[PDB]
Design a protein around this ligand. Structure first.
Ligand SMILES: Nc1ncnc2c1ncn2[C@@H]1O[C@H](COP(=O)(O)O)[C@@H](O)[C@H]1O
Ligand SMILES: Nc1ncnc2c1ncn2[C@@H]1O[C@H](COP(=O)(O)O)[C@@H](O)[C@H]1O
Ligand SMILES: Nc1ncnc2c1ncn2[C@@H]1O[C@H](COP(=O)(O)O)[C@@H](O)[C@H]1O
Ligand SMILES: Nc1ncnc2c1ncn2[C@@H]1O[C@H](COP(=O)(O)O)[C@@H](O)[C@H]1O
Ligand code: NA
Ligand code: NA
Ligand code: NA
Ligand code: NA
Ligand SMILES: [Zn+2]
Ligand SMILES: [Zn+2]
Lengths: 430, 428
């Protein structure tokens, strides 16, 4: 009644870690519970490929790369991940007439550069990549099923529209679950296109309703449903996508499967702002990932994002201001590895005393305590800023111990391996 | 008349449903940390008077695998201690024959031992406890046992553990793990302090110049670092009695409680032509000699193929290593192909539609992860986990040859197999 309901998955037979995540379906932190076993089926919205990627894009996909690494490498979940490529879109069509190199060729060029930029930032490829242009046939069939369930109608011009009012009427369906308050050929203005009749001279595809292109939202519902099925553990994207794009995906997929909950946990990354405004091609305030990488390293860019909670907005100060701290932290990590490897390399088991000293026990106590702190930070909705701080504090105490105390070679090696493990989880490379 | 064992309570603990073969219960029981996700673990180390051999490698590689499974795979927090027995009758005798000081002999063969462990990619423990550095702590430990009335002093200046007195206490049972293997009051009493002949190495004590008894060394060092409850204590099966049963009795007497160790794990021995590989039998192969014939990966595969708590036969002249070399070769060739396909894959010209062949490989992939999880939960069953990896690799090889490849799926599979190989201690 007027408020959307959410069904937490049952805990029986599932991997239970007590991880809590910020779920946009509940607008709260709730315990994460797999639909099945230790498995996480996860779809994340990808770029629309018509130009260079910028630092805002880097923030979203690095943030989700970090979260994936925590889920897999740290918590040992089994993550099946899908990212789409929006290679059919009005922006691409317009840009291709300007560039005169062919529509598929333009989209493929900027998709290729997007993946090169993700690789440069040490962002892992997903399990499956779903390009809209390779799924148009499956999209047409998806729309046919929604129409067959009477949740969409065909205009005379040959477009197909989702029927919001028919969908809401069903007691098992609620439209705009995540942003309820954000709501001539149509029945109602709030109805959105599933199939757009083709304008002349534009790229188009055949369908039962005439030549056209998919509507934006039906692309992601179709592709995610085809690979991951009727219940997604996680669906993600930047916060701007929550409405209309993600709310519309929920309605389409619910209408296709005729059920009530297509996604259990919807995660929305915050935006990178620059001088108070979202970094956007439109505002002409953006910094390309490639330009960023001529001045800073992959590690420094990832540290920038590790210092900001994934689901909050962050301010970026250009001309190196925000990167000053990132460069210092990266510098201290590089210097730490140099020192500890030198101490390990020069340690002589023949001439040492290995008595477990008071200093050895204190360092070990701080070490085990740091493991428990970082565990509680990761359970706390992927709090990397405080886990990074905990690592920095530990490195400060290891540096002191290496300078003066007689070293337990085994304790130093084990601590280095744990720090390596957390840095693999962060996506840092030393 | 039969020893009792108390399973740790599950509240507030990391619970994985791992089952381990506990020599205290002579059965497989669920593993439960004493505190949180922590595992305090002490493992008996070598007696350092000569070169290490393939029997030693079997014990420490087997326990290195188990530690890697516990830490890398299950994400337990393992605090591990391995001792060095550098005071011993064998070291003393060997040092007089060679005409070198006992410390110089022990230090050299401890060094070679760690060099050989590193060559086999065996991780060092958190702490290394040498007897010669803990003698003062051993004396204090013995004083407390005497003060608790569980040990007495002979006229000669030795100290003996008092079995009959220990047994009488209702809270103490002597020889928990091998009950039937059982100047002094009774012959079964064992020395905590041996009065030294004036020509032997010796240390001062309240009872006169002497040396520690064998067993009190390990009780003292383990207690000093890890305390009154060990999650895990391990060693080869020969050490279960008298050495480990005597460690339990001493440490129980020192702390006056009933359970010093929750889970006692005993690796099986490597036999060679039916007899334990032993310096005494002159049937041994040094680790260095083995490594001039086989690689670290191949030697680790040999132990991965044999359950850690069963005995194994080693057939020399390459007979047992044929299979290990074939498996190592197939892992090498698999990684070569999957690494090149990932490196040379071109996103500009590929088609990435998720095909039925992609879906089949993925289902087998996720299914293999679950099989291997159940194998590790089943008392560190690396033989069946290794077989599951081989089967999966067979299907990935087919897919890479014929099907159009999902670059992301191959990359995820590569990372998972790497993760399992890091858990095994294999390096490709
Ligand atoms: N690392 C893992 N790999 C595969 N399955 C897991 C893992 N952790 C938990 N599970 C599954 O989660 C369910 C319950 O977890 P547990 O009670 O921790 O064994 C079981 O069906 C397991 O198969
Ligand atoms: N300035 C930004 N900060 C963080 N994420 C962004 C930014 N701009 C776009 N994104 C995300 O990157 C993805 C691509 O969006 P688009 O800007 O339409 O190419 C979406 O999930 C967006 O929410
Ligand atoms: N990877 C880990 N690192 C540190 N502590 C852990 C880890 N996993 C579980 N624990 C601890 O084990 C206790 C119970 O685990 P659980 O109920 O599975 O969260 C909690 O107090 C946790 O702090
Ligand atoms: N042949 C063997 N196979 C497996 N483990 C052995 C073998 N010989 C010795 N060990 C183990 O290696 C450690 C050192 O024993 P030692 O032979 O006294 O130096 C002990 O825990 C033994 O149980
Ligand atoms: Na409704
Ligand atoms: Na929005
Ligand atoms: Na008794
Ligand atoms: Na024995
Ligand atoms: Zn989308
Ligand atoms: Zn011992």
């Amino acid at each position: 009644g007027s408020l959307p309901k959410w069904n937490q998955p049952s805990k029986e037979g599932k991997k239970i870690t007590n991880l809590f995540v910020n779920n946009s379906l509940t607008h709260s932190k709730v315990e994460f519970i797999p639909q099945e076993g230790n498995k996480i089926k996860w779809y994340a919205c990808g770029p629309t490929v018509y130009d260079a990627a910028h630092l805002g894009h880097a923030r979203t996909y690095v943030s989700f790369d970090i979260i994936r690494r925590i889920l897999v490498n740290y918590f040992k979940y089994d993550v099946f991940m899908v990212i789409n490529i929006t290679d059919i879109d009005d922006k691409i069509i317009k840009r291709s007439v300007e560039e005169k190199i062919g529509f598929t060729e333009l989209a493929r060029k900027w998709e290729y550069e997007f993946w090169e930029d993700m690789k440069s930032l040490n962002v892992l490829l997903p399990t499956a990549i779903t390009r809209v242009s390779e799924y148009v046939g499956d999209i047409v069939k998806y729309i046919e099923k929604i129409i067959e369930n009477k949740y969409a109608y065909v205009s005379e011009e040959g477009s197909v529209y989702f029927d919001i009012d028919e969908f809401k009427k069903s007691e098992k369906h609620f439209y705009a679950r995540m942003e309820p308050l954000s709501v001539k050929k149509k029945k109602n203005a709030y109805d959105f296109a599933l199939w757009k009749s083709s304008k002349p001279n534009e790229p188009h595809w055949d369908s039962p309703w005439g030549k056209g292109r998919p509507g934006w939202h039906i692309e992601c519902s179709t592709m995610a449903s085809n690979i991951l099925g009727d219940v997604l553990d996680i669906h993600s994207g930047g916060i701007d996508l929550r409405f209309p794009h993600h709310d519309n995906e929920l309605a389409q997929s619910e209408a296709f499967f005729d059920h009530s909950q297509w996604v259990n946990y919807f995660l929305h990354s915050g935006h990178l702002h620059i001088e108070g405004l979202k970094m956007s091609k439109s505002l002409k305030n953006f910094i390309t990932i490639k330009n960023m990488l001529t001045k800073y390293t992959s590690n420094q860019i990832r540290i920038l994002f590790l210092l900001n909670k994934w689901d909050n907005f962050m301010n970026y100060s250009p001309n190196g201001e925000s990167m000053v701290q990132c460069i210092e932290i990266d510098k201290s990590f590089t210097n730490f590895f140099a020192i500890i490897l030198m101490k390990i390399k020069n340690f002589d088991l023949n001439s040492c005393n290995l008595y477990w000293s008071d200093a050895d026990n204190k360092l070990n106590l701080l070490f085990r305590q740091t493991k428990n702190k970082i565990h509680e930070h990761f359970l706390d909705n992927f709090n990397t800023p405080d886990a990074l701080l905990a690592i920095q504090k530990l490195i400060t105490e290891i540096n002191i111990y290496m300078d003066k105390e007689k070293i337990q070679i085994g304790l130093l090696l084990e601590i280095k391996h744990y720090i390596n493990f957390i840095f693999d989880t962060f996506g840092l490379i030393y």
